[PDB]
Design a protein around this ligand. Structure first.
Ligand code: BYA
Ligand code: CA
Ligand code: CA
Ligand code: CA
Ligand code: CA
Ligand code: ZN
Length: 316
């Protein structure tokens, strides 16, 4: 909407106070004009019509329990924008400052979040398996990164290309969580998963096997569930990414870590310059090796470590 840029204040899902960029025109709307062509957060009002209504508030204070998922969707979309712009010189998900749209309160008790081809969507959870999913910065950044992939490599969401699509969203979800630097880890969804259980998460990049996901190509899933295992086989690539950053010895193969920033530069370059819609895991290894060669040189430690990591997970 047309109006003037303002700064509201509220609390997120986990009870933390934060400032949010709003727009005033009779009401205060969750419309952040400070980033690209705007960040816009909508209320789906427990229904499944999208996007729903641009979020409107009478006094620019967002401390109601009902407000919390919107505060965090809006704020964490901003953090994710800032990561891509400041770290990768990428302006929004299309590279041309596309408006970022999110809806919260989608459906009733909905234990998930997604990118629907046009916008991010967050359930509230059922309060047992999940609390409102926009409370996890890694979830918000995972979803926005699906939009980045769709505009870049375009990895088809099935089988190995789909498991790479998934791992790219877990990788950059995690690097955005480290960028924001509030309790960062290599786990996915821990801030919003199972409020009655501490220390768990939906997936782990450091040890995918903790939640039944493969950590080696010989354990890949080849059935038809889950679009051919895209949230399962993503563990093989998530483990490779973790080893490139952090190092380790995995099934006897040692990897020298090169740290998160270099992981991000290598996988950002692979995603935007080498991967294609039908890339498989072997092709991802070649893309990552070439990206590391462009950035660091063919005889570099970085190239060696990429090779070691994919060797450690059985991807040639
Ligand atoms: O792939 C998607 O975006 C849809 C499936 N959802 C997830 O992967 C997820 C991640 C973190 C927390 C909750 C759900
Ligand atoms: Ca209010
Ligand atoms: Ca965390
Ligand atoms: Ca995490
Ligand atoms: Ca938990
Ligand atoms: Zn995903």
């Amino acid at each position: 909407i047309t109006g003037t840029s303002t700064v509201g204040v509220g609390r997120g899902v986990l009870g933390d106070q934060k400032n949010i960029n709003t727009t005033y025109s009779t009401y205060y709307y969750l419309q952040d004009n400070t980033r690209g062509n705007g960040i816009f957060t909508y209320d789906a009002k427990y229904r499944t019509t999208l996007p729903g209504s641009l979020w409107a508030d009478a006094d620019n204070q967002f401390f109601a329990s009902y407000d919390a998922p919107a505060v965090d969707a809006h704020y964490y979309a901003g953090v994710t924008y800032d990561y891509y712009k400041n770290v990768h010189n990428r302006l929004s998900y299309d590279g041309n400052n596309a408006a970022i749209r999110s809806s919260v309160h989608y459906s009733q008790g909905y234990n998930n979040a997604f990118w629907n081809g046009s916008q991010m969507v967050y359930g509230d959870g059922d309060g047992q398996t999940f609390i409102p999913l926009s409370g996890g910065i890694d979830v918000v950044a995972h979803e926005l990164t699906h939009a980045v992939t769709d505009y870049t490599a375009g990895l088809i969401y099935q089988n190995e290309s789909g498991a790479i699509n998934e791992a790219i969203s877990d990788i950059f979800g995690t690097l955005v969580e480290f960028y924001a630097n509030k309790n960062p880890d290599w786990e996915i969804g821990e801030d919003v998963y199972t409020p009655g259980i501490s220390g768990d998460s939906l997936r782990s990049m450091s040890d995918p096997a903790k939640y039944g996901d493969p950590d080696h190509y010989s354990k890949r899933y080849t059935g038809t569930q889950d679009n051919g295992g895209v949230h399962i086989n993503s563990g093989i690539i998530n483990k490779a990414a973790y080893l490139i950053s952090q190092g380790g010895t995995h099934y006897g193969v040692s990897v020298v870590g090169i740290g998160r920033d270099k992981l991000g530069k290598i996988f950002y370059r692979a995603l935007t310059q080498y991967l294609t819609p039908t890339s498989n895991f072997s092709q991802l290894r070649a893309a990552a090796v070439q990206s590391a060669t462009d950035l660091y040189g063919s005889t570099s430690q970085e190239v060696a470590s990429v090779k070691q990591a994919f060797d450690a997970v059985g991807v040639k």
